Amino acid sequence: WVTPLSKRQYLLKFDNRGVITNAVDCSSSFFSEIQCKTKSLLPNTGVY
Amino acid sequence: GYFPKSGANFRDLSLKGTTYLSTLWYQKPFLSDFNNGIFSRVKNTKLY
Amino acid sequence: SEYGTFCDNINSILDEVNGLLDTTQLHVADTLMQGVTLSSNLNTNLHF
Amino acid sequence: TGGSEIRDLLCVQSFNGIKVLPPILSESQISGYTTAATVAAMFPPWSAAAGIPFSLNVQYRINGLGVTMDVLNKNQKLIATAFNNALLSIQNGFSA
Amino acid sequence: VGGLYEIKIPTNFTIVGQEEFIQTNSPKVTIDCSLFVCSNYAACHDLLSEYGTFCDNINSILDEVNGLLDTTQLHVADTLMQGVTLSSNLNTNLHFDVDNINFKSLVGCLGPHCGSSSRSFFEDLLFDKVKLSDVGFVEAYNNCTGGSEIRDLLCVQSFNGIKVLPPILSESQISGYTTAATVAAMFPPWSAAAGIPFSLNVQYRINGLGVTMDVLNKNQKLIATAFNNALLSIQNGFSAPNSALAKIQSVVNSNAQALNSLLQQLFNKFGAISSSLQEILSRLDPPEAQVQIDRLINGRLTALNAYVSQQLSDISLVKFGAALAMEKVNECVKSQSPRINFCGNGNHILSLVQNAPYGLLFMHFSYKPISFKTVLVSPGLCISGDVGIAPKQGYFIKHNDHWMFTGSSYYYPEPISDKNVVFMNTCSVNFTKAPLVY
Amino acid sequence: AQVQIDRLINGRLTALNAYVSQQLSDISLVKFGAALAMEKVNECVKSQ
Amino acid sequence: VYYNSWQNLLYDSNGNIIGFKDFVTNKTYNIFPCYAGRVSAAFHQNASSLALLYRNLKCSYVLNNISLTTQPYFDSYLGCVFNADNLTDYSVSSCALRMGSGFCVDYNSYRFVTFEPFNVSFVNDSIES
Ligand SMILES: *[C@@H]1O[C@H](CO)[C@@H](O[C@@H]2O[C@H](CO)[C@@H](O[C@@H]3O[C@H](CO)[C@@H](O)[C@H](O)[C@@H]3O)[C@H](O)[C@H]2NC(C)=O)[C@H](O)[C@H]1NC(C)=O
Ligand SMILES: *[C@@H]1O[C@H](CO)[C@@H](O[C@@H]2O[C@H](CO)[C@@H](O)[C@H](O)[C@H]2NC(C)=O)[C@H](O)[C@H]1NC(C)=O
Ligand SMILES: *[C@@H]1O[C@H](CO)[C@@H](O[C@@H]2O[C@H](CO)[C@@H](O)[C@H](O)[C@H]2NC(C)=O)[C@H](O)[C@H]1NC(C)=O
Ligand SMILES: *[C@@H]1O[C@H](CO)[C@@H](O)[C@H](O)[C@H]1NC(C)=O
Ligand SMILES: *[C@@H]1O[C@H](CO)[C@@H](O)[C@H](O)[C@H]1NC(C)=O
Ligand SMILES: *[C@@H]1O[C@H](CO)[C@@H](O)[C@H](O)[C@H]1NC(C)=O
Ligand SMILES: *[C@@H]1O[C@H](CO)[C@@H](O)[C@H](O)[C@H]1NC(C)=O
């Protein structure tokens, strides 16, 4: 399986042992934008 | 960084033959533009 | 983007201000409705 | 987005990221609450008028200023007419 | 129908308690502008000195703001202590309940022999749910040189010149003042309770709502038990998602958020090659390092001016809140002003005050109807020689085919008399005719 | 273009901070006005 | 335990270095900032010296790691106090040099004393009927 790379901004989450457990492509979707704005994988309940 | 676009597609570019080679296998869309780069997900085919 | 948190601060202060207005409008409406008891027979098309 | 030839400044402000949002309660809801608070003085249980008829509340309030009860309960029609004339004077005074 | 209207009059009642936190204070933030803008770097302190008074202006505004908070805290404490007279025989280790009403949880240690233990059980229960009170900040900063592997943001803020100072009066002193103001209603001379026993003051306040004294002075045990049950319900209510406790935590959270945003301003580049003075001064010589450092100085000084302008705006709201809290101490706790919804919602009986992190917590007690009777009432009667009578805090009712009075807040038919009547030399129209009365 | 755009960014961010500081000041007066209006509803309309 | 074979530096969310592994010895260290802070100096116009408060610092830390001085010192609730007599048992009803938490500096030398601006009025009457 092959997909193109490009220069993009990601949110990255590192666990307590330094493994990347999750990531978010900030411009990929509206929910991805809320996640990057709040720097969290599960944003608080609210209107953004 | 150089990351995939989330929600874009991977293409499965692997080809398996037995005896004959198709001349279409050595043209677009298989022969592909590199641009900035590529991300690959590769199945390790564990034979016995 | 190299000015970082400046736009985040502007958005955060305006969201606080607008939340103060919303909370104030609720407290005014609560003050108007406090203790109001009406008859279910009341119909302002005939009683005025 | 109506396609009009009119160049409203509110549209130009909104396209430059400046926009006024509506309040969480509409002015129609608030006018419902002020209507309810007003009729709460008209009819029993008179919950906004100290638990008595509005005309008696008006009469007792005027009496509290140092006006004898005798002229108030004798002139009740004149007092009610003065009251609703004052209300009409406020409404008409918005046209000035 | 005829001269009478249908009204629901209460036939039974209880006392309900409602909490109200009012903010009267805020964390005293102090900034060292020189340490915040330039850290330890001499090449930056040189350039910052060519900006002249900007750090002097930032320090002067924050010193004025913090002086306004200090003056406000003194005026609140003065308001709590105003007029309070206590017996020197009073000992809260033995004297904690009167007339079947229990105040043990609202009263701390009284007098200096017990030290800083003057916080009440109620105030203890309220303070234990808020980490960053005044003593909370003092302990957090005490731990910054403890060598702990825990990287507290309060330590990082303080090392960047952002620190919260303690208030001029400790919360333990304020808790002593709220304790003294509470016991001033409990025992003679009753200096906070109009000079009469607390239970009689409660009884007269309920009677003032239109409840006959005859039910009150026979139900005195039921009223006292309703009162202390309401107080227990207020205490238990802090274990739930309480709106007063939420408001108190929001004071700490909004402060911690503002300080955190001000610290994050150090890491912005403001269009310079880096946000670190260490990196600039290890990459460039003075002629170009000056150009980069000057961008950081303008960015950081702009962030301080923005934070100062927000702080001035917020402390205006803190002064407004403290002025309201002093007005409630005067007109709800120390006395009962004739203002309907001022001391909380509904039929307000009486109010009490306890200390709280950055404010005061008021308990408002209200007369709450439990059940109702629909009855036919007359707002007035025309009697004898067309003399008019109107009821005081009540209604005229037909009972047993006889005209009788009842209080408006509790259904209890009692005989009509000059004690419960307003006379008029002429009866109004639509007063019910009753020639047989008096 | 960076040197010019950075002057526009500083001008526009300075204008937003000024407008924010004015808005906070005005909303303090709106809260004061609403507190007075609730006091008049309670002490003039619902009671005397 | 978190350093893999290609990794030697530990970073925080802001991009400060907060730890490292030494390339030669493979030993691992956390990095902490050196202490920084102000001195709260109380001054009276009738005095020849300052009373100094090192907020939240114990006097052993001030003397060992910041500076030695000839002045007398003690550990108050607020931190190490220099050139003032510990008199928190004493109390004053007015104070020009307010330090916080009901503590005041007073000047005759300097004294460190409690600030108690308000009193209850006391009467010796019986509480009981
Ligand atoms: C009227 O005067 C009497 C006598 O001075 C007062 O009675 C006393 O009231 C207290 C409650 O405030 C009673 O305390 C109770 O003691 C029992 C243990 O005996 C305990 O289980 C209860 O929880 C409560 O603490 C006290 O016993 C009682 N003393 C007497 C001799 O009756 C009364 O409070 C005064 N006021 C009124 C409105 O009656
Ligand atoms: C420090 O750690 C490095 C990395 O593990 C050690 O270097 C490796 O040592 C093993 C065993 O001798 C070799 O098989 C590897 O080829 C070495 N190199 C690498 C890049 O892995 C090194 O010996 C350690 N030194 C000390 C003093 O502890
Ligand atoms: C500062 O002075 C105060 C007041 O004299 C000291 O506090 C007393 O200390 C003794 C011994 O621990 C206790 O028995 C007293 O009960 C304390 N009184 C109070 C009001 O707390 C304090 O220990 C002194 N501190 C230093 C470092 O000198
Ligand atoms: C009033 O209500 C309480 C609680 O429901 C009840 O215990 C009491 O018996 C009631 N009294 C009357 C007179 O209804
Ligand atoms: C301060 O440090 C001590 C010892 O590590 C610890 O017991 C205490 O809970 C800490 N308090 C705070 C607020 O960090
Ligand atoms: C307060 O009480 C103490 C102890 O009796 C006394 O020393 C002090 O002078 C009093 N101050 C005031 C203002 O009453
Ligand atoms: C109360 O104080 C006064 C004045 O010192 C004194 O005359 C009186 O005897 C005292 N009474 C008691 C019970 O201490």
UniProtKB/Swiss-Prot annotation, chain B:
Give the superkingdom in one word.
Viruses
| Purpose | Attaches the virion to the cell membrane by interacting with host receptor, initiating the infection.
The protein here is known as Spike protein S1
- What gene name is listed for this protein? S
Q: Which residues of the full protein are shown?
A: 65 to 112 of 1356
Curated annotation (Swiss-Prot), chain C:
Domain of life assignment = Viruses
Summary of the function given for this chain in its UniProt record? Mediates fusion of the virion and cellular membranes by acting as a class I viral fusion protein. Under the current model, the protein has at least three conformational states: pre-fusion native state, pre-hairpin intermediate state, and post-fusion hairpin state. During viral and target cell membrane fusion, the coiled coil regions (heptad repeats) assume a trimer-of-hairpins structure, positioning the fusion peptide in close proximity to the C-terminal region of the ectodomain.
Indicate what this protein is called per its UniProt record.
Spike protein S2
Q: Which organism is it from?
A: Human coronavirus HKU1 (isolate N1) (HCoV-HKU1)
Per the UniProt record, the lineage of the source organism begins with: Viruses, Riboviria, Orthornavirae, Pisuviricota, Pisoniviricetes
Which gene specifies this protein's sequence?
S
**Portion of the parent chain present:** 834 to 881 of 1356
